[PDB]
Coordinates of C-alpha atoms and ligand atoms in Angstrom, one line a residue:
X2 CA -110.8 37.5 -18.7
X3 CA -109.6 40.9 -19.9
X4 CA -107.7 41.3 -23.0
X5 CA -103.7 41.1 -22.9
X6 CA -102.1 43.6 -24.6
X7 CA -98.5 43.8 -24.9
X8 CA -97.0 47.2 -26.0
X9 CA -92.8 47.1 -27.2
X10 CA -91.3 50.3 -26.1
X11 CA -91.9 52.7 -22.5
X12 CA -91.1 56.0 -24.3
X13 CA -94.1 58.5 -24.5
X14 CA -96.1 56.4 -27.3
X15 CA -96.1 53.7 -25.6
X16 CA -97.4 55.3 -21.7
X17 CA -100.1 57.4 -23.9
X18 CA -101.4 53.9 -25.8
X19 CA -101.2 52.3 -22.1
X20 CA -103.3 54.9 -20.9
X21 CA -105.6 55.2 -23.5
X22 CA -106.2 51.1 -22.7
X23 CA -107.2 51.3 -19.6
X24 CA -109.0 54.6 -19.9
X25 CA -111.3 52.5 -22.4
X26 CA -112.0 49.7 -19.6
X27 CA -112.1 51.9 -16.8
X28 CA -115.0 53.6 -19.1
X29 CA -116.7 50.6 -21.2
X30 CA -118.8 47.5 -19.2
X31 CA -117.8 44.3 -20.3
X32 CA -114.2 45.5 -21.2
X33 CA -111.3 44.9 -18.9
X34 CA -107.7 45.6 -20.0
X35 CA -104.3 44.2 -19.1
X36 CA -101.1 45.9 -20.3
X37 CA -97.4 44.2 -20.2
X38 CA -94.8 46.9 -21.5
X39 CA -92.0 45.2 -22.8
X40 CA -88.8 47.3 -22.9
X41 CA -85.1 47.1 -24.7
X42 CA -83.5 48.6 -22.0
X43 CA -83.7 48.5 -17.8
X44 CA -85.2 51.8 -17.7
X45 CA -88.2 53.1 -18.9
X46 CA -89.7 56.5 -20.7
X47 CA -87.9 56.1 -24.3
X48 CA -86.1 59.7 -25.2
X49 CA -88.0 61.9 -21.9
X50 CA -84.9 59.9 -20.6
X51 CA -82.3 59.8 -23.2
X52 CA -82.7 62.5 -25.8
X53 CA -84.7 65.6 -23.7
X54 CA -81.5 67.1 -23.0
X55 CA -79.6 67.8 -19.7
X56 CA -80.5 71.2 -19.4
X57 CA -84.5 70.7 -19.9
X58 CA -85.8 68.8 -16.8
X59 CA -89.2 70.4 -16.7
X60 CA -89.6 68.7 -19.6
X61 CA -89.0 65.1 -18.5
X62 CA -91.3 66.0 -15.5
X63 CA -93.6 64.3 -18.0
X64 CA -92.1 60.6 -16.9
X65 CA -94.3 61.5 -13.2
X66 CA -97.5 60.7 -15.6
X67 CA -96.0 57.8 -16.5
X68 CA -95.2 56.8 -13.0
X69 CA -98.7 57.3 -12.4
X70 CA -100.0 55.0 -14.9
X71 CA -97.5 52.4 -14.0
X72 CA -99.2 52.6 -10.6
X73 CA -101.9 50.6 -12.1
X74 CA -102.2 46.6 -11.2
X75 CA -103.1 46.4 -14.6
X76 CA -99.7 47.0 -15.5
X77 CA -96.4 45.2 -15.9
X78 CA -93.1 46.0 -16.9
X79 CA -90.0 43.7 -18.3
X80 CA -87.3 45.9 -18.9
X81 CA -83.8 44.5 -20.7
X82 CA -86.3 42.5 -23.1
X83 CA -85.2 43.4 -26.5
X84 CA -88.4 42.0 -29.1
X85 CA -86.6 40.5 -31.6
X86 CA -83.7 39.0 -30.0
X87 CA -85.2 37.3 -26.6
X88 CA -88.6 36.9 -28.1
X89 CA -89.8 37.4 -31.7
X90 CA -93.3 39.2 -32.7
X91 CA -94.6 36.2 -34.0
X92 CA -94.0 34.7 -30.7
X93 CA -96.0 37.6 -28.8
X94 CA -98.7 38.2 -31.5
X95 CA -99.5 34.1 -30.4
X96 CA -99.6 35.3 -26.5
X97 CA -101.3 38.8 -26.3
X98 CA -104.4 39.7 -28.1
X99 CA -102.5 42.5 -29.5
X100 CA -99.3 44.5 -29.6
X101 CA -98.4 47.3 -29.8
X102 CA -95.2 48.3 -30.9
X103 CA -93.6 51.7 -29.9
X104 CA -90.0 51.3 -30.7
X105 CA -89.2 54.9 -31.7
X106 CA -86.3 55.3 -33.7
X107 CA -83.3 54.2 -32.8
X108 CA -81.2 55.0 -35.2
X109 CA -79.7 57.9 -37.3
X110 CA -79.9 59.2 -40.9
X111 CA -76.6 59.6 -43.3
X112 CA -75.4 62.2 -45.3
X113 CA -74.4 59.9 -47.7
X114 CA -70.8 62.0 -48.5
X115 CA -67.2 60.7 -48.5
X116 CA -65.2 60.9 -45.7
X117 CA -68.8 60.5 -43.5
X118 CA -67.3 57.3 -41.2
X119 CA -64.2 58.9 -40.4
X120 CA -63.5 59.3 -36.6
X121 CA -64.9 62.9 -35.7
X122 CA -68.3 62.4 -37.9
X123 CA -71.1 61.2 -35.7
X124 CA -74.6 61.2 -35.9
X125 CA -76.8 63.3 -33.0
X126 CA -78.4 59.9 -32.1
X127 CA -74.5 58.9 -31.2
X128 CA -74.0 62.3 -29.3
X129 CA -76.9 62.6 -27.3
X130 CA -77.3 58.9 -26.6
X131 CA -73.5 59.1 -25.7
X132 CA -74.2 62.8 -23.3
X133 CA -77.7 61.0 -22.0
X134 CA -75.9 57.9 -20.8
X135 CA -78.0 55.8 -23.2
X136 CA -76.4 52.4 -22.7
X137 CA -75.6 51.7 -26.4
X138 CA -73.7 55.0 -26.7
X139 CA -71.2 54.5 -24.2
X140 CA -68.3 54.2 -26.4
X141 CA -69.2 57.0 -28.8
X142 CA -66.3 59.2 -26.6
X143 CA -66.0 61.6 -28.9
X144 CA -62.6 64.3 -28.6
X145 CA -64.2 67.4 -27.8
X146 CA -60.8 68.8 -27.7
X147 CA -60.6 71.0 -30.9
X148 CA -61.8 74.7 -31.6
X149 CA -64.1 74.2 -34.1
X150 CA -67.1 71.3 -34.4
X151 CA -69.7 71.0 -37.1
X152 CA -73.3 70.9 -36.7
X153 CA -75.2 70.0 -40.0
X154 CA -78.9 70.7 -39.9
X155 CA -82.1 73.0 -38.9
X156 CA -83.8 70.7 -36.1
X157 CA -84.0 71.4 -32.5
X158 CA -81.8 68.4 -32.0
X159 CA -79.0 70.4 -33.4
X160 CA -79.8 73.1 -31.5
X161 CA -79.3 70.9 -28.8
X162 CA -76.4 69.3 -30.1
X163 CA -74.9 72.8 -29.7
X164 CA -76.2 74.1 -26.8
X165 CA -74.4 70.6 -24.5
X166 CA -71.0 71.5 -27.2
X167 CA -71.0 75.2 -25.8
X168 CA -72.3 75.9 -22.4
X169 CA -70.2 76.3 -19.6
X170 CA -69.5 73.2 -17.8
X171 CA -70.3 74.3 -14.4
X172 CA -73.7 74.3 -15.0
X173 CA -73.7 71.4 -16.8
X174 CA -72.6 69.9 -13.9
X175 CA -75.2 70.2 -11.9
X176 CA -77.8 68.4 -14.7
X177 CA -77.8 64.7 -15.1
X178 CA -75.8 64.9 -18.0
X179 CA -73.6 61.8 -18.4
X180 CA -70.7 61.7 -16.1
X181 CA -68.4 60.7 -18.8
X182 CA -69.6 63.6 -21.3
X183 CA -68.9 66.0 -18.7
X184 CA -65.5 65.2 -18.2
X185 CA -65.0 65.4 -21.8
X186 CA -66.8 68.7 -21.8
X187 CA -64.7 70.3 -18.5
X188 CA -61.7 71.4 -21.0
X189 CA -64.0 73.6 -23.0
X190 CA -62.0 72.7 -25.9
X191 CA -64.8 73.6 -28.7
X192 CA -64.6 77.3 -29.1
X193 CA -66.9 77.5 -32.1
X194 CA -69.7 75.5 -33.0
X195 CA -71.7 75.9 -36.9
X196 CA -74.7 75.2 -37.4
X197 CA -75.1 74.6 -41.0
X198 CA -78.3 74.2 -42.8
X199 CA -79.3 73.1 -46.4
X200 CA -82.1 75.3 -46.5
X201 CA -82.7 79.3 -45.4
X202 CA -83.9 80.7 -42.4
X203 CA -87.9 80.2 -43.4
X204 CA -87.3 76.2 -43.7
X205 CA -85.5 76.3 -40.5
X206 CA -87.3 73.4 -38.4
X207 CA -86.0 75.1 -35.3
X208 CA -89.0 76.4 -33.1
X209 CA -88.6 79.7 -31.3
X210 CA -88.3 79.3 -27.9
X211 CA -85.8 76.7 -28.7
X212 CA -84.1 79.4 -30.4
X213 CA -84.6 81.9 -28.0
X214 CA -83.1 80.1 -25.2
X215 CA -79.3 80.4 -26.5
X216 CA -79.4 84.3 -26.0
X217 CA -78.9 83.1 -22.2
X218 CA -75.6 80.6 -22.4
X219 CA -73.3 82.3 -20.2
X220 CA -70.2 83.1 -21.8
X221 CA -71.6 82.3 -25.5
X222 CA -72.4 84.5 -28.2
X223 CA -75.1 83.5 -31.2
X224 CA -73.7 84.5 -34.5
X225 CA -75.4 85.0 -37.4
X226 CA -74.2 87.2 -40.8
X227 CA -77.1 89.5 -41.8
X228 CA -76.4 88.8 -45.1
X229 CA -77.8 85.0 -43.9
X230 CA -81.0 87.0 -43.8
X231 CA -81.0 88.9 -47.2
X232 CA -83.9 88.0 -49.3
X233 CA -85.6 86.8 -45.9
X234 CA -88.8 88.6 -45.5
X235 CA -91.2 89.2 -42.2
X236 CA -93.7 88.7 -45.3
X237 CA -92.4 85.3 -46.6
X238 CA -91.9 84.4 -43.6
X239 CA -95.9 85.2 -42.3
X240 CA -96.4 83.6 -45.3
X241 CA -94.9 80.0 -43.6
X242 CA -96.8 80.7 -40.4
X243 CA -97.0 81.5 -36.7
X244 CA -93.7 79.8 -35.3
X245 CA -91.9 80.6 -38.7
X246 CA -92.5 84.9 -38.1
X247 CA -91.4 84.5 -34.3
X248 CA -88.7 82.7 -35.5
X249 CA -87.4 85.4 -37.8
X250 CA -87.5 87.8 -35.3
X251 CA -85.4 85.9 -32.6
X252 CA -82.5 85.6 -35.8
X253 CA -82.5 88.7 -36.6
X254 CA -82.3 90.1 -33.4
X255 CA -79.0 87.7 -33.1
X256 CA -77.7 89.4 -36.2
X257 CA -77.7 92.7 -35.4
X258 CA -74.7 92.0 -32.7
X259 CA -71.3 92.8 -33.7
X261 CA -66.7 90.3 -30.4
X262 CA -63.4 88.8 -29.7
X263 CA -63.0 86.3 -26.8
X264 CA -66.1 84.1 -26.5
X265 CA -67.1 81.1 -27.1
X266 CA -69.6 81.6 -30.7
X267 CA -72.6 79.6 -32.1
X268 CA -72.6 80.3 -35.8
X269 CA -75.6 80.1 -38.4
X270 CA -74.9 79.6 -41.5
X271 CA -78.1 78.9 -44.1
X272 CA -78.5 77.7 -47.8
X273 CA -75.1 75.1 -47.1
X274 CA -74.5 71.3 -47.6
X275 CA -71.7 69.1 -46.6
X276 CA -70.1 67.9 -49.6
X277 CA -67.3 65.7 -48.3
X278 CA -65.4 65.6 -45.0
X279 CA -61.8 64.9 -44.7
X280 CA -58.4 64.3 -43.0
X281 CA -55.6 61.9 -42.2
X282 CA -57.4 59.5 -40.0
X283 CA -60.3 61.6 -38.4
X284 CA -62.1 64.6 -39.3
X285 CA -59.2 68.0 -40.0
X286 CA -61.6 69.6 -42.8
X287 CA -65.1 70.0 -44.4
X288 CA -66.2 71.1 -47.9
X289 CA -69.1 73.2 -48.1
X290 CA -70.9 73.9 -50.8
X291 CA -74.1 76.7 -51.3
X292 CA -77.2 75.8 -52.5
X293 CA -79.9 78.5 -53.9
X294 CA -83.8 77.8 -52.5
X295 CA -86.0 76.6 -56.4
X296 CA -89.3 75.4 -56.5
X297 CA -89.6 71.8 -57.2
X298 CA -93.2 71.6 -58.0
X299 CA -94.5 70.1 -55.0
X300 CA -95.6 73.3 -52.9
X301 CA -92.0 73.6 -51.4
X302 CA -88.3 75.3 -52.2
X303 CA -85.6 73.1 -52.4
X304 CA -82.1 73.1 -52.4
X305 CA -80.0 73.2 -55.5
X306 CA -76.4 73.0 -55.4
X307 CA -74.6 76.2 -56.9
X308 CA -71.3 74.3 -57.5
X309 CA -69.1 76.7 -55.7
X310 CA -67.1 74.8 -53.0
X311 CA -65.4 75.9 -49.8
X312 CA -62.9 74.2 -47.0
X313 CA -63.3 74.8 -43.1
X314 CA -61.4 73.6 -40.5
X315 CA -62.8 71.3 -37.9
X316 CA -62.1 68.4 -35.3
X317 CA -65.8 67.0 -35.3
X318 CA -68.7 67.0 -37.2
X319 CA -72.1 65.7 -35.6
X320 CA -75.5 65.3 -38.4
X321 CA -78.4 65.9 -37.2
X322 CA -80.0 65.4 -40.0
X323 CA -83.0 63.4 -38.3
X324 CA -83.6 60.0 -36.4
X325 CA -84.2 56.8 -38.3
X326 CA -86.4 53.6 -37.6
X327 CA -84.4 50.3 -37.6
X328 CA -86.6 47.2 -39.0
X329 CA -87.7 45.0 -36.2
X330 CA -87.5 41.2 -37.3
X331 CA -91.2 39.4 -38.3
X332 CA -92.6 43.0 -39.4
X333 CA -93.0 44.9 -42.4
X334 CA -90.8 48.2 -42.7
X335 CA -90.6 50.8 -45.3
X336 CA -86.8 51.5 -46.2
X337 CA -86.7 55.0 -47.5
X338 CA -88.9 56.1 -44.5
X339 CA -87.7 54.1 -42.0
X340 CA -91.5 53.9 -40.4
X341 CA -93.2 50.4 -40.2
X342 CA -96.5 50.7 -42.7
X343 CA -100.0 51.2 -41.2
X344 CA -103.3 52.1 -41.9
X345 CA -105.2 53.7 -38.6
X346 CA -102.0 52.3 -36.9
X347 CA -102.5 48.7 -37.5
X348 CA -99.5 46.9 -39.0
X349 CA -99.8 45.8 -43.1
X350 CA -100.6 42.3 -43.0
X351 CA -101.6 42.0 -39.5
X352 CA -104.5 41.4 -37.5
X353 CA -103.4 42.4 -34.2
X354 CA -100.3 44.3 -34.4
X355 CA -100.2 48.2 -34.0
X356 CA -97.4 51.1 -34.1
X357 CA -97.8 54.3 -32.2
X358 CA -95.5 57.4 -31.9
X359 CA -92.3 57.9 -34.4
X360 CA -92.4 54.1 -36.0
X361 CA -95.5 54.9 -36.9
X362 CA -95.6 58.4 -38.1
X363 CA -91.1 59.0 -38.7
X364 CA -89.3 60.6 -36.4
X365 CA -91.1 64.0 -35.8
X366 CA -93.0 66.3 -33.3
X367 CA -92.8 66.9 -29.2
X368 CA -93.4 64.2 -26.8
X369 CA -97.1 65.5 -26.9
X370 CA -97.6 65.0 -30.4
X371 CA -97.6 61.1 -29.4
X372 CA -100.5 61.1 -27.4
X373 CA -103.5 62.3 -30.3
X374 CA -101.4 59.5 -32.0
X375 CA -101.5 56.4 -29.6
X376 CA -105.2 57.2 -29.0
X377 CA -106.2 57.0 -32.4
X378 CA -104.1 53.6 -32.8
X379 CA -105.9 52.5 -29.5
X380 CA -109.0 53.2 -30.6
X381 CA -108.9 51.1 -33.9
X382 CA -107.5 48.2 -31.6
X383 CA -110.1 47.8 -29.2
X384 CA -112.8 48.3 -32.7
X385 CA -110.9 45.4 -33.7
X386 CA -111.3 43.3 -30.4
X387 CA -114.7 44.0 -30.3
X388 CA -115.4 42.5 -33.9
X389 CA -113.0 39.6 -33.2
X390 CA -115.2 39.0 -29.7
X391 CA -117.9 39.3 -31.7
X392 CA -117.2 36.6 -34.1
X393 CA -116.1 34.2 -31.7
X394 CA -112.4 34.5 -33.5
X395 CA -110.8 36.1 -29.9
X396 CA -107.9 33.8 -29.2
X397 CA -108.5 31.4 -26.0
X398 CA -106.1 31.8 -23.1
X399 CA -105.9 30.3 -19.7
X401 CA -103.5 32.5 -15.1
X402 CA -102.0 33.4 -18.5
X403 CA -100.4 36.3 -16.9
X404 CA -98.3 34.5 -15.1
X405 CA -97.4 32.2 -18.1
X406 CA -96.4 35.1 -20.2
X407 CA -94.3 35.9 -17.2
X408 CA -92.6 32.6 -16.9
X409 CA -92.0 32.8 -20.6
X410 CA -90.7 36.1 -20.0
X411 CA -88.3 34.9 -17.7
X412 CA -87.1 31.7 -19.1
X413 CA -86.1 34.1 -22.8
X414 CA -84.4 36.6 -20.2
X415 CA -83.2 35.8 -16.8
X416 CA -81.7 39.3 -16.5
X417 CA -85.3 40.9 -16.8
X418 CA -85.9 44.1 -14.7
X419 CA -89.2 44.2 -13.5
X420 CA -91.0 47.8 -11.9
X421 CA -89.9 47.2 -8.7
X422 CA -86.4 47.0 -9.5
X423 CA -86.3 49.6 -12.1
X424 CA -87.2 51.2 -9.3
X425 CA -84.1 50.6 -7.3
X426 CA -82.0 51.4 -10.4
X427 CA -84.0 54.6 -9.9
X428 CA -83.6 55.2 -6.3
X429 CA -79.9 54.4 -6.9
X430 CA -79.5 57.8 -9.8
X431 CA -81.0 60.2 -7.8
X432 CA -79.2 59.6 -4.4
X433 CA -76.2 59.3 -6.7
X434 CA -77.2 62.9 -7.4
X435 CA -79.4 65.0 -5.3
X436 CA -76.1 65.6 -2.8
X437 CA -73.8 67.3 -5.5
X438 CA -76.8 69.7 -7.1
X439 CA -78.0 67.4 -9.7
X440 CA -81.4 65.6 -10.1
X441 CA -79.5 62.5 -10.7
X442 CA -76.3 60.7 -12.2
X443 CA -77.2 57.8 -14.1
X444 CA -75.7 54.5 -14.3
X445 CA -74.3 54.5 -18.2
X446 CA -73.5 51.0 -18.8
X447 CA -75.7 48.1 -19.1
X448 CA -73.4 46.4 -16.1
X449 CA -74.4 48.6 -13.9
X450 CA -77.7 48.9 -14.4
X451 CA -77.8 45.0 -14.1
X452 CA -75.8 45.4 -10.9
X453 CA -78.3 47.4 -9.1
X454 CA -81.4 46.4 -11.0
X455 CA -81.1 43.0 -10.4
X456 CA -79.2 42.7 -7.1
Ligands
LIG501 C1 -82.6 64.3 -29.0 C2 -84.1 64.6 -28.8 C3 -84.5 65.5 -27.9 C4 -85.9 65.7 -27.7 N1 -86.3 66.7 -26.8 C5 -87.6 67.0 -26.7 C6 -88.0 68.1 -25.9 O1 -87.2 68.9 -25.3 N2 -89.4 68.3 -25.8 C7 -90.3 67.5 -26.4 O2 -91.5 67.7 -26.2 N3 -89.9 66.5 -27.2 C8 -88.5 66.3 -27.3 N4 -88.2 65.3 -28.2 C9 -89.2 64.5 -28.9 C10 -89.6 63.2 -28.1 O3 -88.4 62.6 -27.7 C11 -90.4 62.3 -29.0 O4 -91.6 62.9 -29.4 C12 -90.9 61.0 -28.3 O5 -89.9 60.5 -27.4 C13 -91.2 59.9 -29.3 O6 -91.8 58.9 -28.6 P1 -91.8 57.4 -29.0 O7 -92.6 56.7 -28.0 O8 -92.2 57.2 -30.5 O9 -90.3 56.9 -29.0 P2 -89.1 56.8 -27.9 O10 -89.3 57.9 -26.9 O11 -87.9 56.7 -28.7 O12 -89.3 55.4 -27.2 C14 -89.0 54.2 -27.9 C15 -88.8 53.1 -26.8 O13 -88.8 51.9 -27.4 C16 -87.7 51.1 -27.0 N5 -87.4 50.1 -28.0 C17 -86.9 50.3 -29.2 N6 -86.7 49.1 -29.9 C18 -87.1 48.1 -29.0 C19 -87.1 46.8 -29.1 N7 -86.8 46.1 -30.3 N8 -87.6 46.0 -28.1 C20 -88.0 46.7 -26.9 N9 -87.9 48.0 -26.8 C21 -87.5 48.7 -27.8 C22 -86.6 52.1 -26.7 O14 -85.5 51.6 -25.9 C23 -87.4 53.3 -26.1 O15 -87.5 53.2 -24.7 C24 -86.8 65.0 -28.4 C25 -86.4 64.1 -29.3 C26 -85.0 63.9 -29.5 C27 -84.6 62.9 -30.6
LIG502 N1 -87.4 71.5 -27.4 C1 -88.1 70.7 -28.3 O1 -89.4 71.0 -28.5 C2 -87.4 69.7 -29.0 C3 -88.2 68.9 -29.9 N2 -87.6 67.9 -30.6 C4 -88.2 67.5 -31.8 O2 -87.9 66.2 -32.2 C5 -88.0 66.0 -33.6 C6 -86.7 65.6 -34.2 O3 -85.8 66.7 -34.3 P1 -84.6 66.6 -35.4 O4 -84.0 65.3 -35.4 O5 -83.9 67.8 -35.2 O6 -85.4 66.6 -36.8 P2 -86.1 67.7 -37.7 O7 -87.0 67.0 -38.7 O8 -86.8 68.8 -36.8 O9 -84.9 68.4 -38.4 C7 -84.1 67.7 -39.3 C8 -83.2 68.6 -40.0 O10 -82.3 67.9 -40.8 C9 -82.2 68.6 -42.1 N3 -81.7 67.7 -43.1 C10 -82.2 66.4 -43.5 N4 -81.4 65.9 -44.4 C11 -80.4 66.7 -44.6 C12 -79.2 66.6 -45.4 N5 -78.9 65.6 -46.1 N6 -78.4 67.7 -45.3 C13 -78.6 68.8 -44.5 N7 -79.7 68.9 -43.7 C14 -80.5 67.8 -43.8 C15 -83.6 69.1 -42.3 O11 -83.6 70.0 -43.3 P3 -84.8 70.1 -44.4 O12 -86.0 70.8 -43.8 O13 -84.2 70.9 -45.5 O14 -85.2 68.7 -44.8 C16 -83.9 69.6 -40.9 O15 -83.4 70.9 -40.8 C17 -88.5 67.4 -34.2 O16 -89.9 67.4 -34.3 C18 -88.0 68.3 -33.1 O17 -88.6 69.6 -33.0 C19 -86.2 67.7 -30.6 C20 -85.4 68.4 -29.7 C21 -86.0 69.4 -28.8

């Protein structure tokens, strides 16, 4: 028989770690490899779907890999299967070999400041799971009606964030950009967004072409004080390294433009929110500056001056990072929000593995995933081998189609790879006529209607 393995998740840690399995039996005698990918929602590829924003399709041109390892008969998919709620990892460490879970992170991290759940103060995870059509996000509806929104942090996700606030909705229009975010976005009622980080310029997590990219938003100008850039050096900055120097460059050559009329993306450095307030939703946020001190751990930090100051603004979106959510039957670490590991196999476990941002937090480009699931891959397959070895592998029957029955009798409403690929079909005819790759289904209702019909 070959070995069952049954990976959680279909984003890019999850395709890499399918690959990698097979890769190992298509290469090793006596080792054959059977991969069920077990997936929360109908559709598969994780955030190359909902978080690679509307405006960056090359860069989900990634999920045609996927496809390809899909291809393989190897292979099985059962989307709408959420682990923990229709079947429990203690459930599939008893029917696979080993798992493999590659749950990402799902949800967001808090500021932790007053005034932080008032209507108008989302998290990024909210806003671009709400302008991706990510299923759980279709209620976010945020009013994107007033002048001035709030960006907090130095990531490319609020980069992002900004970018989807501020460019002109025609073109959005023609990306697969949530229907419903787009007609929220047709008024172009933000005329300012801030993008306010803790930190200075050489801390930035932004990386350059990322930040070179906004120089081309029709009808928006980048602003940036160039006293946001006193006491910033080229030097210092070589200092940080490669990306950090190109970086510099791109912001200063954004602060040395003067204009009335247009639409402005604003930079503002060494800031923290301090509280957020109004009557009922978000009128106002207090701002306080911070000066860059050596902690002692090889870094600057942040320290608070004291000194306080009130801006306007109708929303305020943190993108402050992603978050892991504990997944019931496994160990999780709290502050981290990462499930514990060594070589990628769970604490306490024999069989169960985490690849991509559960594993290693919520950090780096889809590529960074694959190094990553191969190295966890590699570790399960040593493991196998000493389990096979020691006569300890577990014994199973046409088990395949057991675990599918099981499968089926925890969720009727399963989606399977041939009708995610109708639910596929569906988006992009829904699309390709009016300019746009395609216009996803936002709802898990109509996903079911077309996936399972
Ligand atoms: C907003 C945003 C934009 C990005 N844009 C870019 C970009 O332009 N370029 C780039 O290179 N990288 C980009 N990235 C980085 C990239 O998205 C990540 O590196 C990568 O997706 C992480 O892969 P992952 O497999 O760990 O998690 P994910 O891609 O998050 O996949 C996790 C999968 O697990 C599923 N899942 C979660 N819990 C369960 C459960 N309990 N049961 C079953 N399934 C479950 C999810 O539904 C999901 O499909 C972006 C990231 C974000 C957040
Ligand atoms: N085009 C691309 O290549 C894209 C890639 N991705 C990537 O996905 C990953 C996730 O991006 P993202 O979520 O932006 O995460 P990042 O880790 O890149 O950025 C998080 C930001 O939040 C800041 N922050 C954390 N806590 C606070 C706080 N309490 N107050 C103010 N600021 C705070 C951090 O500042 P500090 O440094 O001071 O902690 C940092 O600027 C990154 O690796 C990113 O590059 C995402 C989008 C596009």
């Amino acid at each position: 028989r070959p070995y069952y393995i049954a990976i959680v998740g279909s984003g890019p840690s999850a395709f890499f770690a399918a690959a990698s399995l097979l890769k190992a039996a298509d290469t090793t005698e006596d080792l054959d490899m059977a991969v069920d990918m077990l997936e929360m929602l109908p559709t598969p590829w994780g955030l190359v779907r909902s978080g690679v924003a509307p405006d960056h399709p090359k860069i989900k041109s990634i999920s045609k890999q996927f496809e390809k390892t899909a291809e393989d008969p190897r292979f099985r998919f059962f989307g709408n299967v959420v682990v923990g709620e229709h079947v429990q990892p203690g459930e599939l460490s008893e029917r696979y070999d080993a798992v493999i879970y590659a749950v990402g992170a799902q949800s967001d991290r808090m500021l932790n400041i007053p005034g932080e759940d008032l209507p108008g103060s989302i998290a990024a995870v909210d806003f671009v799971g709400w302008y991706n059509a990510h299923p759980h996000f279709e209620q976010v509806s945020p009013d994107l009606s007033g002048a001035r929104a709030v960006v907090i942090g130095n990531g490319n996700v609020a980069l992002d964030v900004a970018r989807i606030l501020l460019t002109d909705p025609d073109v959005l229009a023609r990306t697969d950009i949530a229907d419903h975010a787009l007609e929220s976005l047709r008024p172009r009622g933000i005329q300012e967004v801030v993008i306010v980080g803790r930190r200075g310029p050489l801390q930035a997590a932004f990386t350059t072409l990322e930040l070179r990219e906004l120089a081309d938003l029709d009808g928006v100008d980048v602003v940036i004080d160039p006293a946001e850039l006193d006491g910033i050096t080229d030097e210092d900055a070589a200092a940080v390294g490669k990306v950090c120097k190109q970086n510099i460059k791109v912001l200063r050559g954004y602060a040395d433009r003067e204009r009335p009329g247009h639409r402005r993306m604003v930079f503002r450095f060494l800031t923290s929110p301090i509280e957020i307030k109004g009557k009922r939703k978000v009128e106002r946020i207090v701002l306080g500056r911070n000066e860059l001190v050596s902690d002692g751990s090889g870094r600057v930090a942040a320290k608070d001056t004291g000194e306080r100051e009130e801006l306007p603004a109708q929303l305020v979106v943190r993108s402050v990072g992603y978050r892991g959510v504990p997944t019931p039957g496994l160990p999780f670490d709290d502050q981290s929000g990462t499930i514990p590991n060594v070589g990628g196999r769970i604490n306490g476990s024999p069989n169960e593995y985490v690849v991509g941002w559960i594993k290693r937090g919520p950090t780096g480009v889809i590529g960074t995933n694959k190094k990553d699931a191969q190295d966890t891959v590699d570790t399960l397959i040593k493991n196998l081998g000493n389990a096979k070895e020691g006569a300890e592998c577990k014994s199973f029957p046409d088990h395949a189609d057991q675990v599918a029955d099981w499968l089926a009798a925890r969720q009727p409403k399963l989606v399977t790879s041939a009708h995610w690929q109708v639910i596929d079909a569906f988006e992009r005819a829904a699309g390709e006529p009016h300019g746009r790759p395609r216009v996803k289904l936002a709802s898990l209702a109509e996903l079911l209607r077309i996936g399972l019909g």
